[PDB]
Design a protein around this ligand. Structure first.
Ligand code: FES
Length: 93
């Protein structure tokens, strides 16, 4: 499985995700994570990837530069490695 660490403003939590699954399913169980559209079309769930890789090609909101800087729509992101993501980042846009 992939090891996912969510670095939230109130602490870090680490959990495993079966390959191919979205991290938000167990993530929302283990932490209070902000969501709105749940479909990759807003920035409510924005996070920043610190290490590892995701597939977030389901998303439509971020521009190429934001993706290149490591921003991630956590509601649709699918890990492709162990990943560390800082959550609650929408105020940086
Ligand atoms: S909740 Fe809208 S993009 Fe994730």
């Amino acid at each position: 499985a992939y090891k996912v660490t969510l670095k939230t403003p109130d602490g870090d939590i680490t959990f495993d995700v079966e390959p191919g699954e979205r991290l938000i399913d167990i993530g929302s169980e283990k932490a209070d994570l902000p969501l709105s559209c749940q479909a990759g079309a807003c920035s409510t769930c924005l996070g920043k990837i610190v290490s590892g890789t995701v597939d977030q090609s389901e998303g439509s909101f971020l521009d190429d530069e934001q993706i290149e800087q490591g921003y991630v729509l956590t509601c649709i992101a699918i890990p492709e490695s162990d990943v560390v993501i800082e959550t609650h980042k929408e105020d940086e846009l």
